[PDB]
Amino acid sequence: SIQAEEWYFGKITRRESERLLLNAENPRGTFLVRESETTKGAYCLSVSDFDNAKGLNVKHYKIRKLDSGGFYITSRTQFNSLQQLVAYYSKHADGLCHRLTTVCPT
Numbered sequence: 818s819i820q821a822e823e824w825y826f827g828k829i830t831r832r833e834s835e836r837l838l839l840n841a842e843n844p845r846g847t848f849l850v851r852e853s854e855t856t857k858g859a860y861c862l863s864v865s866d867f868d869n870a871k872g873l874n875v876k877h878y879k880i881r882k883l884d885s886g887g888f889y890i891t892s893r894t895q896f897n898s899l900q901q902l903v904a905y906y907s908k909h910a911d912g913l914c915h916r917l918t919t920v921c922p923t
């Protein structure tokens with residue numbers, strides 16, 4: 818089901834996620850989910866941001882998945898699915914650079 822998600826890019830590198838997100842047309846919150854390069858079993862949420870100090874830039878957030886079933890960036894805020902995690906962060910910025918807006922174009 819995760820592999821079926823249009824925002825799930827699978828096995829792409831961190832640099833590739835940055836190449837895709839650093840497009841001048843991408844508004845704040847453009848995002849994608851990929852596998853972590855070095856953490857087995859973990860995903861990575863790559864998100865674009867923009868401000869006058871840094872200009873267009875990218876942030877990465879590790880998503881952990883417990884055998885017990887929960888998905889989360891912070892253990893205080895867990896979800897029953899990756900889909901629910903993405904939906905929540907599309908409404909709440911919380912500690913992220915921006916709420917998730919649009920799926921990163923390829």
Ligand SMILES: *C(=O)c1ccccc1OP(=O)(O)OCc1ccccc1
Pocket residue numbers: 831852853854855856859860861862877878879880
């Ligand atoms: C996403 O998993 C993530 C989160 C924060 C920094 C980088 C990052 O991408 P990774 O593909 O996991 O690889 C780089 C990394 C650097 C430092 C610690 C963990 C991952």
